[PDB]
Amino acid sequence: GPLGSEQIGKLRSELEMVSGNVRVMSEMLTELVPTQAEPADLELLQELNRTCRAMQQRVLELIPQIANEQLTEELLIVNDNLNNVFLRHERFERFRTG
Amino acid sequence: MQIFVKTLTGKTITLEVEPSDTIENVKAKIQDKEGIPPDQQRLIFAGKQLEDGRTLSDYNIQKESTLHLVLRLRGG
């Protein structure tokens, strides 16, 4: 629907899944030590990054399609959270390398 | 106690466990009601990967706690 409220039920389930991915990635970055993380941990972080990257494109696609202002702001916040975890991962990698 | 195990696929698994239950026991419980082989289960708590040998008590996992289940990809 143009407003965003028409398919809110469907959208909520989608967003819960997106938020779950961001949470696991965020919490792993906080728990893991850059220079101590094992290859297995790094593998998972990359898996989460890949998934969250595709989810970000989807969120960016939804934003302009939804008329509702509260829902649009919610999506923008979710996008902010994705960028935040991506930057942390970038920082994590800078520390681990170089 | 009752704990929750959330997947990254929109599923919330409610388990009835005990503080003394080991991570191995928990994975077995998950297979029992979800059909997911233990060898393919990656359990995480607050960003920390869990070892099959340790117990829920060891990781300070208490009542109403939420764990995350990440499936190992069969082809990476």
Side-chain angles (χ1 to χ4, degrees), chain B residues 12-23:
Chain B
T12 293
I13 306 170
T14 295
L15 296 180
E16 183 54 53
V17 298
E18 291 301 312
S20 56
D21 287 349
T22 65
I23 298 302

Side-chain angles (χ1 to χ4, degrees), chain A residues 16-17 20-21 23-24 27-28 31-32 40-41 44 47-48 50, chain B residues 6 8-10 12 42 44 46-49 68 70-71 73 76:
Chain A
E16 182 277 355
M17 191 170 148
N21 274 271
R23 175 181 290 282
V24 176
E27 291 178 354
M28 280 184 64
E31 173 74 14
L32 294 174
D41 301 308
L44 182 45
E47 159 161 14
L48 291 165
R50 294 199 293 275
Chain B
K6 297 183 174 183
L8 293 188
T9 62
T12 293
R42 287 184 284 186
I44 305 176
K48 189 186 186 67
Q49 199 58 53
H68 292 282
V70 176
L71 307 171
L73 307 180

Side-chain angles (χ1 to χ4, degrees), chain A residues 51-68:
Chain A
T51 302
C52 288
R53 289 281 176 182
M55 290 172 154
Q56 173 165 241
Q57 173 64 202
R58 162 63 171 173
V59 171
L60 290 174
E61 295 175 336
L62 282 170
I63 287 171
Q65 300 292 61
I66 293 179
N68 185 292

